[PDB]
Design a protein around this nucleic acid. Structure first.
Ligand SMILES: Nc1ncnc2c1ncn2[C@@H]1O[C@H](CSCC[C@H](N)C(=O)O)[C@@H](O)[C@H]1O
Ligand SMILES: [Zn+2]
Ligand SMILES: [Zn+2]
Ligand SMILES: [Zn+2]
Ligand SMILES: [Zn+2]
Ligand SMILES: [Zn+2]
Ligand SMILES: [Zn+2]
Lengths: 417, 100, 86, 59, 346, 67
DNA sequence: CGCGTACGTGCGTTTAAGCGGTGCTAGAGCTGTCTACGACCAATTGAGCGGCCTCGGCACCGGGATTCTCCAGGGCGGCCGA
DNA sequence: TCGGCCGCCCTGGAGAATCCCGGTGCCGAGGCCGCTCAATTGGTCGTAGACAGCTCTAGCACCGCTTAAACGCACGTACGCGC
């Protein structure tokens, strides 16, 4: 109401659109809107952190990209776009009745996609990916090669031992690989694929500082806590402080136990992963506890999956843009087997059945999902585990080439094959 | 499977929450008044009562019965049951020392 | 000063004492955890009665607890005792 | 009773408020044990065995 | 035989280590932790147990030196928590002196006096490390043991209170100086935006206290939050590894965390909780669980206190919530062993 | 000795008449025999012949002495 | 109805309650003096109760959020006994 | 051989009831006023109680025998409890 009245003074050439917060109409303009012309208040910036990369079960965004609220949104018809625009924002910044006019357009393109750049009072700056990139963005020296040693890796909430597989693919010599896990299927996977070399512990809630000390020094501590109780798109979520969210704190403890003391300058590195859909207070508390700001890395650059994840850690050069390698499969069609056709160009895991086979809507294959996530083929085919269990295992797992990108400079710090 | 139906635990416990959170009288006023008059017929013929006297009798009688069903429910729980029985009321009144 | 603090006299109530008080009470079979609970209940009962009787002695400006103060302390708690003067 | 009235979002003490005020306190309940307060009711206190088990099996 | 142990040293020319100074016995298992001399095995076992045990009535339930129940006196200088029996004082320094000591409440005890040689008492230099070795040999449990802080090398306590204020308590307990506000306690209601840089700016901390909300659920934030933030800021406030500095902590739960959160807290704080019941007013009043690394805090729990009765009290308190004060007085006592670590304001 | 120990908490340097201690003993034994009679009724009601602390707690709950 | 544990029974030990003396002394109990504290009575007034009034705190009505409650279902699956 | 049936997890969706939120209305409580009788003040007697003194009763303390009973250990079968 008040915001709508203000926008009146904006179009009467009495107020600059760049001087008003186009999300909620607050006067406390501090930052500029990264996607379009206008200002942004701090409160809306926090809302913008949570809501932009939230997707519903249909594979489209949960909320409007502009105001990061809205009660009824317009979905986008154009290929590979997942954005939504709430009716209210469209009926202000573009013009009155433009929203219902977009409702009636059966082949409709949203304003983020359409070829033209000017749309009424709404203007889109062309540098929005780079500004968005920067918006979401004790140093050890290099060790000389002869002094390099095999890496020792602790992987908490190890899952299917993706980290050891990545280090093997990079040809780094692994002295030992200790892994905490509770799911029998996931325990089996590591044993088989890595030939018994993986020391399986059990419940991470049994792991003491004494255990960590007597297991010998660790060179790399890695992990991803369960995201079911952190991800905001779960209505029944218990947050960071209840249910399975609190396993992150156990990770924080064992990382603290595994970190060298001050004055001991031996090389040590860590990587923690979580979903982008994590709450403002949850994300803030995690970011404060790990004493760093997260780097946001999207799988779509190197892994042909729309999987935007936060990575806390101290791996060197982890800000540098992702450079694809020829080995990597940037296309979903370059991962499916012959006779199957990809609906979309990227799979969505944070149409429901993204396969066209024999003019029929088929579901995603487990092995094709393996190839998408960058795992060497038939990695999770070890025991007599259900399709549901293998799907859940691949879903919770890391994107392999993203982990290869992050782990890549560790080759300059430990012994290589 | 169109008409909805609850469980025997649910509706009973909702009634327990409803009648614990309320204060009003549960016995009807006129049958309780006829009961008080018929009991008073034996001790003296042709009484008269005040409305406040009958309401005071009803307040004290309902409070006495609610405390009695509290001890009755404890006696029922102690015998590994949930259903109260006349054994429970006789036990509660025999431990209160009122069997005379 | 010249008064040793008496202690652990709740164990002076022996197991056969509670056994005989359960025989007079008509009890046929006594469990092993009866005795601590019975000592606790007897201790709380003596706490209440002596808490009344010492206050009756206090107001009388004496230092001797009489049998009449015990009878007054019990008759106040609705347990009228006979044989000691009402 | 003023605390029990403020909890119930009321600025007038009804006998329910005196009932909750006396019976929640332990020394006032010891003082007024054999005392009935008219239009009081009882305390909202349900035993922990008559409720259905709203739990989940860990295995 | 208590006037004989003052005769075996002076006349027979024997070593104090060769006589049990507790019960007068001639059989010596080990060497006494606080002073030079020997201790028989039962007195040794009981002496260790007595330190763990916490008494509401006095600084020590049973006597320090000989572990007797009665004949307890209070230390003169209020910055000391030591308590000795009358029979130890009579037997060692001489008859008719215990009465003189007990007669005043301002009589300087043996550890506060400039000279520690009274006539039959010998102090130990850097005794706390030897004391840790004493716990290591027989106590079967290596409980968290920070070096003791001498009176001469004493520091003003730097306190960080999270989610609950204790300035009134510590002021009543003599940890914070009244009248003068240099700011040796910082109360921080909201800590979501606290950073290591902030804590470094706030000055180095020696004691960080946290506590759960009171039973009236004042705030609409899950109670585990207090625990987890307490752990985080705790780790931040720990001194740089390889530094002789005391760091104490205590997280207190007034039965607001269920068994899940209880095990979680017990795992992070790496010990079992401490359940404390309050003075019965007929049946049971309220109770509180406490994690800490402060000496004689783990043994404060009383085995008589059952879980089911505690669950019933919790559910009668949570639903009723008549009183809504944080039980400051309940958790007030537990800091009492800490008295010998920081300066006391009378 | 139990009566003197319980009396030492309320007042120091007390003094009992022998008839007062005998009256306390008569009243306490009669109270315990009545309590074991109600405890025996609570034991029989639960289809048992063994009294348990549950029976003493139930008897003192129905009497109204949990206060 | 099955199982197992824990309580009653019995015998040998030893712990101390009970009884019978003495002592002494703290303290209950009685008696004598007296004085200050409360009953009684007269004056007098202002605080407390009957009566009036007016107005807002709460009872009731109506609508939306919501929130536990009950049941369908996917799948699954294997397994299984038909 | 081989296809069709009961736990298990997981999940949530209709759905009847309940909590919250407003809107209206009413009657009961808060506040004002007269008045009148009970609270107050002043004074006076009379005896209840405070206090000194004496005495002499019983209460506490100690000690030494003496068995009565409390304790401790084995053991086995009857009852508590789970199904
Ligand atoms: N309490 C616990 N203790 C140990 N592991 C647990 C756990 N709770 C959940 N987990 C495991 O931790 C995993 C976190 S999902 C992360 C999987 C892993 N990062 C990967 O790349 O495969 C889950 O698969 C779950 O099986
Ligand atoms: Zn804004
Ligand atoms: Zn919008
Ligand atoms: Zn689009
Ligand atoms: Zn000894
Ligand atoms: Zn001292
Ligand atoms: Zn001593």
């Amino acid at each position: 109401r008040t915001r709508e009245r203000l926008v009146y003074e904006v179009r009467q050439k009495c107020r600059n659109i760049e001087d008003i917060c186009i999300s909620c109409g607050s006067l406390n303009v501090t930052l500029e809107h990264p996607l379009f012309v206008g200002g942004m208040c701090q409160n809306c910036k926090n809302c913008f952190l949570e809501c932009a990369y939230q997707y519903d079960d249909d594979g489209y965004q949960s909320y409007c990209t502009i105001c990061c609220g809205g009660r009824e949104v317009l979905m986008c018809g154009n290929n590979n776009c997942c954005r939504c625009f709430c009716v209210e924002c469209v009926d202000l910044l573009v013009g009155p009745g433009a929203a219902q006019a977009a409702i009636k357009e059966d082949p409709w393109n949203c304003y983020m996609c359409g070829h033209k750049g000017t749309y009424g009072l709404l203007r889109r700056r062309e540098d929005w990916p780079s500004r968005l990139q920067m918006f979401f963005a004790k140093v050890y020296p290099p060790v000389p090669a002869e002094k390099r040693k095999p890496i020792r890796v602790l992987s908490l909430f190890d899952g299917i031992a993706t980290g050891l597989l990545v280090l093997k693919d990079l040809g780094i010599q692994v002295d030992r690989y200790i892994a905490s896990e509770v799911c029998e299927d996931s325990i089996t996977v590591g044993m088989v694929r890595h030939q018994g070399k993986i020391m399986y512990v059990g419940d991470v809630r049994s792991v003491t500082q004494k255990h960590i000390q007597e297991w010998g020094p660790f060179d790399l501590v890695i992990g991803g806590s369960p995201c079911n109780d952190l991800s905001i798109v779960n209505p029944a979520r218990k947050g960071l402080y209840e249910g399975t969210g609190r396993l992150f704190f156990e990770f924080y403890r064992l990382l603290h136990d595994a970190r060298p003391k001050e004055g001991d300058d031996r090389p040590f590195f860590w990587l923690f992963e979580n979903v982008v859909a994590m709450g403002v207070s949850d994300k803030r508390d995690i970011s404060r506890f790990l004493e760093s700001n997260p780097v946001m890395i999207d799988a779509k650059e190197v892994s042909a999956a729309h999987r935007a994840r936060y990575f806390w850690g101290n791996l060197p050069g982890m800000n540098r843009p992702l450079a694809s390698t020829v080995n990597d499969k940037l296309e979903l069609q370059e991962c499916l087997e012959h006779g199957r056709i990809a609906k979309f160009s990227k799979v969505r895991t944070i149409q429901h059945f993204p396969v066209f086979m024999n003019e029929k809507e088929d579901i995603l294959w487990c092995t094709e999902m393996e190839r998408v996530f960058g795992f060497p083929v038939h990695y999770t085919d070890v025991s007599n585990m259900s399709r549901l269990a293998r799907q859940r295992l691949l879903g919770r797992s890391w994107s392999v080439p993203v982990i290869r990108h992050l782990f890549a400079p560790l080759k300059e710090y430990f012994a290589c094959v | 499977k169109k008409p909805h139906r609850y469980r025997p635990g649910t509706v009973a416990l909702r009634e327990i929450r409803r009648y614990q959170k309320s204060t009003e009288l549960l016995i009807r006023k006129l049958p309780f008044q006829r009961l008080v008059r018929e009991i008073a017929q034996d001790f003296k013929t042709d009484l008269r009562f005040q409305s406040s006297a009958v309401m005071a009798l009803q307040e004290a009688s309902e409070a006495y019965l609610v405390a009695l069903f509290e001890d009755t429910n404890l006696c029922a729980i102690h015998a590994k049951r949930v259903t109260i029985m006349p054994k429970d009321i006789q036990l509660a009144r025999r431990i209160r020392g009122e069997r005379a | 000063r010249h008064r040793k603090v008496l202690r652990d006299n709740i164990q002076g109530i022996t197991k056969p004492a509670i056994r005989r008080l359960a025989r007079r009470g008509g009890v046929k079979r006594i469990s092993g955890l009866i005795y601590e609970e019975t000592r606790g209940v007897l201790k709380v009962f003596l706490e209440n009665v002596i808490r009344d009787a010492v206050t009756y002695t206090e107001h009388a400006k004496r230092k001797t607890v009489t049998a009449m103060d015990v009878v007054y302390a019990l008759k106040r708690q609705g347990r009228t005792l006979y044989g000691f003067g009402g | 009773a003023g605390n029990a009235a403020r909890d119930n979002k009321k600025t007038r003490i009804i006998p329910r408020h005196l009932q909750l005020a006396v019976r929640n306190d332990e020394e006032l309940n010891k003082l007024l044990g054999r005392v009935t307060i008219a239009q009081g009711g009882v305390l909202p206190n349900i035993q922990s065995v008559l409720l259905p088990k709203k739990t989940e099996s860990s295995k | 035989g208590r006037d004989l142990i003052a005769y075996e040293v002076k006349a027979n020319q024997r070593n104090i280590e060769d006589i049990c100074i507790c019960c007068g016995s001639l059989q010596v298992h080990t060497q006494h932790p606080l002073f030079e001399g020997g201790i028989c095995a039962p007195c040794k076992d009981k002496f260790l147990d007595a330190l763990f045990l916490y008494d509401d009535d006095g600084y020590q339930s049973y006597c320090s030196i000989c572990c007797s129940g009665e004949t307890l006196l209070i230390c003169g200088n209020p910055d000391c928590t030591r308590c000795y029996c009358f029979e130890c004082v009579d037997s060692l320094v001489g008859p008719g002196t215990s009465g003189k000591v007990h007669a005043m409440s301002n009589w300087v005890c043996y550890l506060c006096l400039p000279s520690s040689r009274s006539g039959l008492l010998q102090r130990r230099r850097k005794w706390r490390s030897q004391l840790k070795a004493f716990y290591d040999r027989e106590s079967e449990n290596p409980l968290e043991m920070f070096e003791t802080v001498p009176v001469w090398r004493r520091q003003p306590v730097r306190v960080l209170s999270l989610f609950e204020d204790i300035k009134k308590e510590l002021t009543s307990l003599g940890f914070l100086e009244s009248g003068s506000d240099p700011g040796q306690l910082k109360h921080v209601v909201d800590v979501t935006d606290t950073v290591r840089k902030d804590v470094e700016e706030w000055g180095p901390f020696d004691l960080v206290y946290g506590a759960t909300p009171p039973l009236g659920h004042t705030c609409d934030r899950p109670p585990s939050w207090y625990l987890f933030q307490f752990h985080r800021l705790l780790q931040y406030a720990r001194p740089k590894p390889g530094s002789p500095g005391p760091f104490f902590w205590m997280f207190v739960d007034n039965l607001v965390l269920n068994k899940e959160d209880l095990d979680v807290a017990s795992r992070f704080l790496e010990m079992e909780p401490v359940t404390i019941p309050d003075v019965h007013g007929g049946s049971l009043q309220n109770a509180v669980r406490v994690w800490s690394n402060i000496p004689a805090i783990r043994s404060r729990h009383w085995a008589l206190v059952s879980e089911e009765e505690l669950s019933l009290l919790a559910q009668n308190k949570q639903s009723s919530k008549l009183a809504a004060k944080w039980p400051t007085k309940l958790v007030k006592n537990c800091f009492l062993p800490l008295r010998e670590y920081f300066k006391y304001f009378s």
